[PDB]
């Protein structure tokens, strides 16, 4: 069985970054020629692994994380980065062993009047831990007076909407991001490249 890479990369809809999707890849053969031949990726960088040898290596388990962010925020999907995405939406660990793949998606996630169905977390007291997902929608308290579930001054909804319009700049345009995590534990390898077993 080949690894399910079309369902992650060819997916008709991606998840919001605050509620990023994680798909477990296991017990399959992984051919990365699907990503090699396609010249649409703006970012293809790997950590602890070279991107060219991925067809020669095997892993015990592979995780595939996917979401949509701005082009100006793609650089925050990397170890040791800071920002609203890295601190409150998606935090890669400093010992991250895997790959980060991103491509422009203005043709798929932009609407004329504005696509407001993609959200990021704007308000949070503390920074996220590595590989942490916060799906909470509780009203954020910016002052000393409790909100009691009511929006107002110093009482705001924690999630915000991207404004994704086709006439936006490349920094404001939507980018689809796939994060591949690799683990090598003392366990049988489930995901292998075609060059290997």
């Amino acid at each position, epitope marked *: 069985n080949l690894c399910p890479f079309g369902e992650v990369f060819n997916a008709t809809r991606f998840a919001s970054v605050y509620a990023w999707n994680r798909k477990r890849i296991s017990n399959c053969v992984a051919d990365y020629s699907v990503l090699y031949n396609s010249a649409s990726f703006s970012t293809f960088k790997c950590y602890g692994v070279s991107p060219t040898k991925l067809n020669d290596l095997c892993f015990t388990n592979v995780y595939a994380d996917s979401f949509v962010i701005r082009g*100006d925020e793609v650089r925050q999907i990397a170890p040791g980065q*800071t*920002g*609203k995405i890295a*601190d*409150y939406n998606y935090k890669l660990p400093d010992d991250f062993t895997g790959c980060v793949i991103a491509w422009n998606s203005n043709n798929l996630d932009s609407k004329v*009047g*504005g696509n407001y169905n993609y959200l990021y977390r*704007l*308000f*949070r*007291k*503390s*920074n996220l831990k590595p590989f942490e997902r916060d799906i909470s929608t509780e009203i*954020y*308290q*910016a*002052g*000393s007076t409790p909100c009691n579930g009511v929006e107002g*001054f*110093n009482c*705001y909804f924690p999630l*915000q909407s991207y*404004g*994704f*319009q086709p*006439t*936006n*700049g490349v*920094g*404001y345009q939507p980018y689809r991001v796939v994060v591949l995590s690799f683990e090598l534990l003392h366990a049988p390898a489930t995901v292998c490249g075609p060059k290997k077993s």
Partner: antibody
Amino acid sequence: VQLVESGGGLIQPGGSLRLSCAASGLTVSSNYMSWVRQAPGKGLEWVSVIYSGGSTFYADSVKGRFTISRDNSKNTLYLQMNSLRAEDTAVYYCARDLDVYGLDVWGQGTTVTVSS
Amino acid sequence: DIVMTQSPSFLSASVGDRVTITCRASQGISSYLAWYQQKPGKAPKLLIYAASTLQSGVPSRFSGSGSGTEFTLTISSLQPEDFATYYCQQLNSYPPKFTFGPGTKVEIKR
């Protein structure tokens, strides 16, 4: 809700000066807090911002020389300004940043004059 | 660095006139636009955020419109307290967090 600023004054090039922003009606440690400066007879320019999680960001004109910080017990924002040049002369504003919602709460401003 | 511009730089009008001031961006910044009012010797005051949404406490005569590269700030009936300078601000930018415009000074006509 108010922001009270203090610390500004006259300083020579290469000197140092610490700005303060006392807050009432909002919690500094739970908000995006930004410093904005406006040169006399000029426009407004961003300087620094401190995230609620501790992340700090500076403009390229002040990076390495300026340091933003906060004190939760005093609910006061600070801006350390070292190696000051003449181009840093402006009225400095501390403001609560609400991102896409704008800067709603502003301070009265304090004057920084750098000259030999 | 996306460039912000405002036109005109100076503008004279009388009380009751319809005042339209324009802010432009070098590239498409969607609705990431905020409008401010600054009077001599005072801090800027937030009027409109998200390029069309009025801030609480701001009179309804102030209106915001536009999306992309062109934005407009309209005051339907000019009032004696609206004679000031108005700035536009691009939101969530890179490298700087936010970039203001050159400003427009509204002055009394006689």
